[PDB]
Design a protein around this ligand. Structure first.
Ligand SMILES: [Zn+2]
Lengths: 16, 151
């Protein structure tokens, strides 16, 4: 099996 | 918008990884020698350092790198897979104590996450919870110099 990415954290809190 | 920290999954396990100096790092005891998924198929580890419980991949798309701490402080902050920020006093090279101990379940699935200095730079990766009767009072972590030397 492979490791998958299921989400992300941005430290600064920067909004899209 | 990019993230320094990725929430990751395996079939049996769930953990974090932290991007630093262009490498995406996490704990061996989570990822093993496993590859990382990408839209072009699996990517192989660039680093595997069982001695230190550390593996690295190339930084994924949608990621940002953390700067290593040159700053020195012993006031650390551990970021969990829910984006909670947990204050931790640094004791030794690879040890630190929670200012407010927590049930161990609160740290669950967060190994591979970053310990940050006051400037938000990388001090180490959260390695393991030191428990007493279910309460986590301290944490082991992989110092960031271990990453730098591995490179
Ligand atoms: Zn610092």
């Amino acid at each position: 099996g492979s490791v998958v990415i299921v989400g992300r954290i941005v430290l600064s809190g920067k909004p899209a | 918008v990019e993230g320094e920290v990725q929430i990751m999954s395996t079939a049996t396990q769930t953990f974090l990884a932290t991007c630093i100096n262009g490498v995406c790092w996490t704990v061996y005891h989570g990822a093993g020698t496993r590859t990382i998924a990408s839209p072009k198929g699996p990517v192989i580890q660039m680093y595997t350092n069982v001695d230190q419980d550390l593996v690295g991949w190339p930084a994924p798309q949608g990621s940002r790198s953390l700067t290593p701490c040159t700053c020195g402080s012993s006031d650390l902050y551990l970021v969990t897979r829910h984006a909670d920020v947990i204050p931790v006093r640094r004791r030794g090279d690879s040890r630190g104590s929670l200012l407010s101990p927590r049930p161990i379940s609160y740290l669950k699935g967060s190994s591979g996450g970053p310990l940050l200095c006051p400037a938000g730079h990388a001090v180490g990766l959260f390695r393991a919870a030191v428990c007493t009767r279910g309460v986590a009072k301290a944490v082991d972590f992989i110092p960031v110099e271990n990453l730098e030397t591995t490179m």
